[PDB]
Design a protein around this ligand. Structure first.
Ligand SMILES: [Mg+2]
Ligand SMILES: [Mg+2]
Ligand SMILES: [Mg+2]
Ligand SMILES: [Mg+2]
Ligand SMILES: [Mg+2]
Ligand SMILES: [Mg+2]
Ligand SMILES: [Mg+2]
Ligand SMILES: [Mg+2]
Lengths: 384, 384, 384, 384
């Protein structure tokens, strides 16, 4: 289960670089130089790294300092072969964003948020990023009157439309991915789930430029089925990117290493991604727990990739197993993939076997055989 | 706080008619004749009733029995002035639907589900219903392999597209409303939230025919902010109908009377519905707790309407209060409603006050004054 | 992974016998004769069965009918070698219990509840049960004023104290196990978690007669860590019985087969039970999903046992692995088991190395190496 | 609704002093001098303040610096009349506590944790505190193998037993209150609920010295009914202290101002506290949202007290209302308070009206009238 750059595993600078500050505790780890993280991640078999602007260039940096930070980073990329497939903007850490970036009540903040984003889009394109992620972590509210959500969605649409106009005007070959999260750090975050983000995208001026960057743990913070949400994103043609991690149910955003948290959901996710031929980066947005020293950081990052590869093997073995293929037919997964009424509406209406002569009791008595199928899945997951 | 038919309060037959059977207990109340529920609800000030096909016509009824059940119902409507603004299909109670209706793995069940739906659409139109609700309570899964969600969404789209073709072909002036629910009775239900349903609608052949019928408790079963979800539905122009009830957080679907559960969310919901001028029925999908006898049933139904009317008064007083209007300006809700960059992208890019000369620290120091605003909201809610 | 009666796997009659009625659907399976379930479970390798009174003897049965039902059951036990290690009372299905049994507001219902319980205690003892489970599924409330919880706890204590007096007065060698559940079918259930039940037991007149019967899914309905709760029950010496099943997070009580739901929690549970030498029955309180026919029922029941046995193997391999034993030392699990201050309070107070001369920064820099340990656990779970 | 020191409202220094650092953002507010918070809180009508050691004395302070910080604080208390009813230890912020204080795997850390606690107990007693709170926020785990919970409970018991020995040996008139929290900042925290803490206390050497300090939001992070948990704590005689705040369901610990979050739960809490004659401090453990400037901080703190006082008025009006008193009798709350079987076990067994002659159907048909009662409660809450 050794990862290669072929597997397209990517990590955010902020992931292995998380110093371990949480709402109740100081940092337990010193800051990592991005150059060192690139080197270490390349040694582990990562394909690339991702960054917020403020991960790479400290907020408030001069243009010459910005120059220097990028050149050092680019040299590390050249030295390692690491790619930068995705970049994003930090519109959540600085106090100015305390009420949001794109949907801050203050108009001048929203304008600043856009300008900060645009500057990093240019850098992202320069570094070869194909996807630009937007996580509006501060877009939302703790109280009902603070945020008229219709106005805020107007502002959110306006911001994304202007970004789309910007990338079009520049001829950039980059697409946007909206990363939903239901809550934290705001009491409720706008576009809280994959579904809300998908629906929002359809109201943008150029919907083709926008997809979703769902995160395992974020959908699970709403108790939702992450593979189901990913399937809907795939069905819509909008799975531009994905954030992999672990989460133990409905609580604060844990960002455990991938495979931790809901392991069976991870299995079904990998099954779906591989079956659907998802070709984008397998990006880990995780935090090595603050209990860990730097050896634990790299162990946790390695485990992200290891668990993906183990689940990939098990999911492939599951789907390739002739006994499973028979069980899938026994459960009529093949019939699910057949049109209900390719014969059309009138033929359906005239079809007495569909209603007047339909034996509802004989159909009702047919067991779905889902439990045998699921135990085969369990056996495959466990290597049993 | 006396409701009138003007207030458009509607109730499902299955609500006050719930006999109190839950997963662990037998019925505590005898069945209600729909005619009696119409009469009793009219006496309480309801505007109308809604029904599943199987609420009104017992499953398996002959055409003559169906005739008789409808005529008796129509006479009660004529006797009371009650309307039927919405109807829906029971595709969840009968064992034949144990794996779904529209997305059952068995093709013959999916065809039956459509035929059962179409027959009730005709009846709905005959009775004057403007909205036809679809709650796919059995569409989903308990295990990952039982349901290929992409195929299931194909089947769901196919079903809704055929229904849209049917109503168009018939010239019916009826629209569809998809009612999301995250789980229960399936382990996960497809289209689990308002967002997922809104996104799905955009992939239908005639999206204009479809909106959402969100339910308070259902979004709260995912820990989501129901007023936020309603605002997004309104923003999309898709709030065709709404189900009002109460829910105490993330657990089984309680269907408490409206105002029970999350009371402040109910306040903000009423505020939003009234502010946005939502003109559809205020429909209660609730269950009088099985502790109650029939007097408790009507008390609970009356309380649904009473609580809406109290919250409506309090929300109106909140918005009309000049001190609140000043607080809203203090929190810059007015600025939220102003375009971020009506001057356009180039003007934004050339605007040094938006970035180079933006004083981020002075902007960051501005308090949002949300807590004063929210306490005014609290004072208004409590009549303090 | 073939179960034997040695493994002490037990099943409730109501589990494989669940007809599949849920809040939104009719039964999908015919009733099972308890005699057939005993036979079928014995064939699968079960050790025994458990029952509510009303599972075995239909409510309202005459004494001669009761006689006949028990004799038939006893013959099936004799025919199969199956034991009955646990019995319990149905104080939740009949409408009379709609507000509880032991804590119903109506005094006459509480007296009936006790008499119904006592009659089944006699039968339980006759059939050889060692543990008598109490699941107060109806003890609770949907609204705040319906139930004064202090009075209800008084009534609950009174009921359990009288049951303890009864078994003592009769010389019965049976102990009681309180089964907590946070909610469903009541909006909130009294004694909602293992902790609340453990705390309550300490206020009973004869605490030694009472322990807990925690259920995997029930603690997970509160988002709690089930192995942690079991560890506290073991630490208290109160793990008299355990209900094994699966649950996908905070939602309605799914009662999935064991190993489904949170698989890693199942691993850590089995690890703990086996490490602690828990010698009681491994009881499955699960429901074969109503999608299933009877073949699916027995497949699901078999999978309960299979998954326990697989996890048992993996947990044993984990603990036996010298690399894991080294990792446990690296994470200082050995130091956790050493007393903090066996030298006593005064020695601690005089120990300058414990404070004045304690190098907090050197201690803080020590990584816990938990992530390497957890990935070894993952590798062992997955057979990697 | 003006608070007076009579109302015993207390605030932690860390509450109004929270600088607004959250997992995704920097501080939005400058640090508050504790002297200024005491002054400002006294002006608002607070009765007193509480503190962690590290709130009052910066970690690493010299004895002379510690001297100075305490003297300045004591002068502010003398200047304002403010009391310090409760103190606690910060065993969670410093990196040394990353795996816990009392249950850290490292023995030397556990010894340090105790010594740090003992030093602050002395200061607490000097300042007049009656209750010493222990919130073991770092006691727990993110992974199953990191923490043997039985060993950890041994260590937790050992620590609390040594603290009890210490206060006894010193003759201090102070009691301990364990503050449960289910999770955050650890993935799972030991003693996660009021129930677990109550059960744990019963295993301590001197249980009479220990009670619970439940927090509204913490129990609601497990989806539990906070008034129910408080009632059990009162029933056990263990409600030594209480932390009041608001929480919107199962998510990260919001620490909203009291009355925010679940408003009806706040109503029922106040009803219970006032009805039971709880005489301890009404302590607010809340965080003014980081959107706020200092005016918003004091507005939020004032709203804590205001909402308590409004709910107190409404709960008193509810209980004093003769129509409610009649409704309580209609729902048989009076019968709930009567013993089930004061006549004793034998009389119960011989009572044919309790079983053989009990009319279960007539009892079952009696409505509980809970919905009318709850709507009266709603009307009273809303001032309707
Ligand atoms: Mg995350
Ligand atoms: Mg992410
Ligand atoms: Mg519902
Ligand atoms: Mg509904
Ligand atoms: Mg259960
Ligand atoms: Mg159970
Ligand atoms: Mg808190
Ligand atoms: Mg607290």
């Amino acid at each position: 289960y050794q990862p290669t750059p072929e597997d397209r595993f990517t990590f955010g600078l902020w992931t292995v670089g998380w110093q371990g500050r949480d709402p109740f505790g100081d940092a337990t780890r010193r800051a990592l130089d991005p150059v060192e993280s690139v080197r270490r991640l390349a040694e582990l078999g990562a394909h690339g790294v991702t960054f917020h602007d403020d991960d790479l260039i400290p907020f408030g940096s001069s243009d010459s300092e910005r120059e220097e930070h990028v050149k050092r980073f680019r040299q590390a990329l050249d030295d390692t072969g690491m790619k930068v497939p995705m970049a994003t903007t930090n519109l959540f850490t600085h106090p100015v964003f305390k009420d949001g970036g794109f949907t801050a009540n203050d108009r001048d903040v929203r304008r600043y948020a856009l300008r900060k984003t645009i500057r990093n889009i240019d850098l992202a394109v320069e570094l070869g990023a194909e996807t630009y992620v937007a996580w509006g972590g501060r877009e939302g509210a703790e109280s009902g009157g603070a945020k008229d959500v219709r106005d805020a969605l107007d502002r959110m649409k306006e911001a994304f439309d202007l970004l789309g106009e910007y990338v079009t005007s520049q001829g950039y070959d980059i697409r946007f991915a909206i990363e939903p999260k239901p809550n934290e750090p705001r009491g409720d975050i706008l576009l809280p789930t994959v579904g809300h983000a998908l629906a929002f995208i359809e109201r943008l001026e150029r919907p083709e430029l926008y997809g979703v960057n769902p995160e395992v743990g974020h959908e699970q913070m709403a108790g939702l089925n992450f593979p189901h949400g990913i399937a809907q994103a795939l069905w819509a043609g909008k799975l531009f990117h994905i954030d992999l991690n672990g989460q133990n149910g409905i609580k604060y955003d844990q960002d455990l290493r991938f495979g931790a948290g809901d392991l069976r959901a991870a299995f079904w996710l990998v099954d779906l991604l591989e079956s659907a031929g998802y070709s984008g980066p397998r990006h880990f947005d995780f935090k090595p727990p603050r209990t860990e020293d730097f050896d634990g950081v790299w162990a946790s990052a390695a485990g992200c990739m290891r668990n993906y590869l183990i689940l990939k093997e098990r999911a492939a073995a599951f789907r390739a197993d002739p006994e499973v293929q028979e069980a899938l037919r026994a459960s009529r997964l093949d019939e699910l993939a057949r049109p209900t009424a390719a014969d059309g509406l009138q033929a359906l209406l005239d079809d007495r076997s569909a209603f007047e002569e339909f034996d509802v009791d004989a159909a009702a008595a047919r067991g779905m055989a889902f439990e045998r199928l699921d135990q085969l899945a369990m056996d495959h997951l466990l290597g049993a």
